[PDB]
Design an enzyme around this catalytic site. Sequence first.
Site, short mmCIF file in Angstrom:
data_model
loop_
_atom_site.label_atom_id
_atom_site.label_comp_id
_atom_site.label_asym_id
_atom_site.label_seq_id
_atom_site.Cartn_x
_atom_site.Cartn_y
_atom_site.Cartn_z
N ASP A 147 20.16 -34.55 11.42
CA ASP A 147 19.79 -34.24 12.79
C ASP A 147 18.30 -34.15 12.94
O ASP A 147 17.65 -33.41 12.24
CB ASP A 147 20.45 -32.92 13.20
CG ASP A 147 20.15 -32.50 14.60
OD1 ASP A 147 19.44 -33.18 15.35
OD2 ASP A 147 20.67 -31.44 14.97
N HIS A 161 23.09 -34.82 15.69
CA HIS A 161 22.81 -33.63 16.47
C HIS A 161 24.07 -33.08 17.13
O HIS A 161 24.06 -31.94 17.62
CB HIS A 161 21.73 -33.90 17.52
CG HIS A 161 21.21 -32.65 18.19
ND1 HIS A 161 20.78 -31.55 17.48
CD2 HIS A 161 21.04 -32.34 19.50
CE1 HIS A 161 20.39 -30.61 18.33
NE2 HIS A 161 20.52 -31.07 19.56
N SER A 191 20.81 -26.60 19.58
CA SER A 191 19.59 -27.32 19.95
C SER A 191 18.60 -26.27 20.47
O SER A 191 18.43 -25.23 19.82
CB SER A 191 19.97 -28.43 20.92
OG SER A 191 18.84 -29.16 21.35
#
Lengths: 527, 412, 617
Positions: C186, C316, C122
């Site tokens: 994602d 994600h 991320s």
Amino acid sequence: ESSSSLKGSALGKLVVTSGLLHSSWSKILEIHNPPYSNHDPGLQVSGLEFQIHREEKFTLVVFSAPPICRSSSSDSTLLHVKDKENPFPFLCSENNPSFSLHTPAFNLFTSASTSLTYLKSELLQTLKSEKPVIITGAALGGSVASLYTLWLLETIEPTLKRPLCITFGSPLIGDASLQQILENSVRNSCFLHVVSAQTRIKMDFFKPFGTFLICFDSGCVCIEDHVAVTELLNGVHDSGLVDYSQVLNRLDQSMADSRLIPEDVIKGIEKRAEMKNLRFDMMFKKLNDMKISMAYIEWYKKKCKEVKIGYYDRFKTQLAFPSKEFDINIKNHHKSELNRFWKSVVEEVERRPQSDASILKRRFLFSGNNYRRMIEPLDIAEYYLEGRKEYRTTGRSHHYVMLEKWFGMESILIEKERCKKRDLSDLLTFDSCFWAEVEDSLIVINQLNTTVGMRDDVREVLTRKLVEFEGYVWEIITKREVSPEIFLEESSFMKWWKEYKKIKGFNSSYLTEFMNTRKYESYGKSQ
Amino acid sequence: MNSNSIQSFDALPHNLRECFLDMASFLEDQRIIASTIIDLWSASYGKEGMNNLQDLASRNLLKLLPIGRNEYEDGFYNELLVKQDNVLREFAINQCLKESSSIFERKRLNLEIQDNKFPNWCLNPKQPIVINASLFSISTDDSFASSWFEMDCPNVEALVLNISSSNYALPNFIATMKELKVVIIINHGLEPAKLTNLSCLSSLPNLKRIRFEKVSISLLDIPKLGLKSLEKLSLWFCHVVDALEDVSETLQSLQEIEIDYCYNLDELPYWISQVVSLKKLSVTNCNKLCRVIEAIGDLRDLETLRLSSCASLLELPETIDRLDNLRFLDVSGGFQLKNLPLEIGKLKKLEKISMKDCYRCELPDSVKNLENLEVKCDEDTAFLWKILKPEMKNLTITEEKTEHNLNLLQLF
Amino acid sequence: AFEALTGINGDLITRSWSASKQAYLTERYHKEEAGAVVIFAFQPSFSEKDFFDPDNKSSFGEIKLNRVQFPCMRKIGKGDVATVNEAFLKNLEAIIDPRTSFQASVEMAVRSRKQIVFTGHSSGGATAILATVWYLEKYFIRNPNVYLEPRCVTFGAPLVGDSIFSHALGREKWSRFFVNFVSRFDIVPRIMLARKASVEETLPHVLAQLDPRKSSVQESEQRITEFYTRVMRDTSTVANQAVCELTGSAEAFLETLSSFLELSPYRPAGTFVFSTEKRLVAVNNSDAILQMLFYTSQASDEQEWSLIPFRSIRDHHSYEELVQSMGKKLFNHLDGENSIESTLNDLGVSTRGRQYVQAALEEEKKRVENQKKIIQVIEQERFLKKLAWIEDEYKPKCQAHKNGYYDSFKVSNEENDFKANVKRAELAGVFDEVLGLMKKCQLPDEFEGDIDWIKLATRYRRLVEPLDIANYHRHLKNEDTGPYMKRGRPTRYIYAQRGYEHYILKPNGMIAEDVFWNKVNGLNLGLQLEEIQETLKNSGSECGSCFWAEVEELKGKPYEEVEVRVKTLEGMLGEWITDGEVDDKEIFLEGSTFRKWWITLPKNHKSHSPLRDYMMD
């Protein structure tokens, strides 16, 4: 897989996700479906309805009109550049001195020019302020809104923001001449005509201009190519009301399908698009050849100085009485090629400027300015051999005029210094009509001497044109703005001076002192 | 003078020093179009003349300067200049003078007449006056009044008339030159020289080449002269006047026509289309020629058609599609040429198209039919052919780039 | 095979993912030594401040890189610098701050010749990308070794840089070092394609939902569905613009539309590896990656549409699965296979999506084709000869005339001068065509770094820029459009200069401007630094090729007007001659305009001049 078909669908999607269609159309709906109404008996009660919406980050203008006659309302008004009823003189060209507009739309614009003239100034200011302006209309309302947009496109500099006109099922507006004027032009890029795929338009006299959003149930295609738009929309007058609320909804769905547009049409757009790209590239590579032609002309000019006639005179003489081969090549190879090239340059860039900030970029603008000063004198020599008169105010080819205007505009902004002791041997006279002045004064001197029965009043005008020319000549020498080559023995300027000496009299003449004392032999030379 | 003027002359093979000696028939710093010298040499030396011109060049007896593509291989020599240093030329003039102490026996006779003052030999009492010369040149100035003497010139194979006058009457003793093979008339004057008495050429049984430079003539009236053994006609920078009886079997030997720099030519005379024996037709730098008559299709034996650097020629006659024997089509320099003939592909013997600057020329579909074709052009012009190639049998695209120099300035 | 493309091997992948997980617990960064491998993993953040900086006024949180500490992150010829996400960059800055161990740990791993890896999940991935280029700028470009190459490995990272950023990684040949793993749905790789104002209402909630250490107190459907809808709508807009702009096509309605569109600048940087249940699909081409970012995250039926925003959040966290299932997946390289159809079908890309992705890849093939065409022209003898004639024939002969080729060209007496001018125009055409293509980004990214090209341009610039300056002045163009150094100079010459300067100077981490001002200060001119910098504006004492222009601007003016510029010019002439910029066989000749103007200078100056021995008087 064609880069054009890809671009068309991607561009249609861009327009849709824009929200420009939903903005424009919802405002149009409000004309006949007013949002706030009052029922007071007191406040309640054919032509043009219109409403201004001064939103926060744009100003939108809706025009609306009475519904159109269908069976025979084609009507055509012709607008000539010299007609004074013409609201769009700036649209006319030398190849297109006139055009025609659908008459109901035209008259609806004219009637309302009053009270909307005021609007025009604001909108221009609004744009000048960097605030967008949309102008929109359904049907004949769109026709009128398009005329209004055109009215706002009088001055197109690459740096002024431009209005966007958005149309919904409008009829056509212009003829084939309006189309030619607008093609591949920045103006042309200000119009998006949203139309239904099932809509057909009779196109024997009125022709499409601007960009078209062609809408299907599966989605839309943005088409810029006007022969493709003709192909897709020409039929025999098969109009049907299209509820564009419904079209907008179905575009919104976007859950587009295969084969919205026929393959042959796509191919045509691609072909014409690629020819256009190659033409643009060619202009850029061919500039180098034109500079090489200029180099041959440099050597012609130096030789002509050496032989003491000067290039302009040699060009004139040799054109009237051909005797040497080099000159024939200068005229028919190099000057000819240069003229076709630079004419085409000007005619192209006043359609599509060359950069965000400039009509002509520096390589084009600067070498165009050199080309003007170097080669307009040859066209003047030709012009005067042909017996034509008054070259400056009646004879200049347009491209020379534009190249001058543009170089002047940019010159305002250029830090430069002219050194008062530079050798000026190679100066290119700034006034590229200078030889036209020389030839006009020669003509007036002939009129004075050879005309008998001339009235006194005329003679005075002639004589003062004479003293005027003398003052022009003295100022350009003073300001060091003429090539020293005007003083070559065999040139037309020295001819002018010989003839004039005999006619002129009794006045301060800094020119005659300058000539009599021979200081012209030092003009433009230092150490 | 130099140790390689006298010595490179004294070493010269026979033919080369005879050619060097021919150079004495030209004026001081004359700009000679090589075609002139090739024509002159043709009678004595055949096709070896360009070889001789190059030989003299490489041993520094003359200078050669190209003023264009100069593809001399095709047989065109309008694009090469010859200059000679005036010292070498004066040497040659005096070699011609010392070959015979009698002007009547001299092989090369270079006669000069200023202010109409004829030399004493021309005014001699005991007529007949007979000259022995093989090469005969006559230079007259701009005040020359063409009041000629009478003489016989039985041996002259080549005549060079260097004229500077507004008007010029060819001398009648030309009519005695039964052995004449080449006639070269060049005007150095400002005004086009208006020729008269061209009929003195009419009965010369061996006359094979004529070249006019910067003269004024009726191109239309040329066949009225007969010229039954003429093989080549060249007109350079010549003014044409519109306009005597037609003749039977006119120009029956005519084989090559070259027309260059004819600035007021606005239409091919019809008789050129009717010369069945014609092998080569070259029109170049004729800037008022808008059109070429379609009668040219009548020219059956044509092998070379050159319509080149004609500023105003916008299209070609479609009837080119009848020129069954055409090998070579040269339209280079046609900046405004818009299309090739529609049925160009019908021609089964066409081996080469030259179109070096015809970048606005469209190509007809028929070109695909042409096979084993060479196209000589520029890169821009090469673009359309590069697209056609894959569909075509053995197309060769030869991309020519220009050689920049100042040589045309000599013609200033 | 995989390692062939990416330079990483699954052992490193899994270690990097592990280290990423560990970076959640740590503040800012975690270091992990595994034998000769040293992994820096960066802590993600799930606050909105960490994607869209509060002080940043722009619509996408972007800022320009500083040209001085990121001297490669720009377009060389054009000069324009890369742009990055300001919040990510500030994170990196806080980490490299000397109050942390990060830099000392990096230097220690470098001295030991261990492999350095930067990973994150991320936004930590984002930081990793940035950290990599910082390392590339501080250690790799200086003294590059195989031992010293970094590896950057991200999982579900958001986009970081713009198109210039990507371009620069391309030109430095650094983009091979970047592998970005993205699961197909994602959201994070997509978020930064949306305008701040499109998602600011719903970003905090979905970021919290993305934070695995979350309350998930409110699990809101509308907010997630809203967020997804806005993100993908803005993403479609960017993609469509890109389709429209790919070919260098005339773009007139698009231009018109630009007033009503506001599109994110971020572009994929590095290799992207898309993951589905079946496939691992590697992709190098940034444009194609962007299209894929839109088209692999679509739905087929309405029910799916309801579901997708949610899978878009869960995926994600699909990266443990991915790391564990690498051997169970069908690996391919999009860029390299002749039929992408089934590959992109297994990723849900519509047929049109294929045609967009396809066009992007074809656009790279055409950039390559354009390179081959340029190379062939430059290779041709006729092109080469012109430089040679100028170099072996024009210049020797003009030196013999004893004024040199600059003044000889300027006194345009002989046919050779005309031939020189014609060669000069023909060469200008060739290099103006190359520059045309560079300006529109229609050559590969590597082109401006290509040493053969740099050398040819430098030879051409040194040889012929003097002739274009001669041409400018002999015919008084300076008196029409000003001094050459401002409005005259052809851009082709500036591109060549910058390419050469960058090639010569990047190994030592200085930029040409700073080199120049340091030399100037070392001249001891004795004026105040800002005053000297203003006296030297538009000087062309910055380039040797531009020397004549300085002389043409200085000659004939009162010495005291121009003492600074005279002394700067003199001061750099020595190295100019050393390096080959300026020719010592041409300038000092009696004929030369420079020599003749110099003897005009006052006597003291001359006595104290570096150049006095060279010229008499």
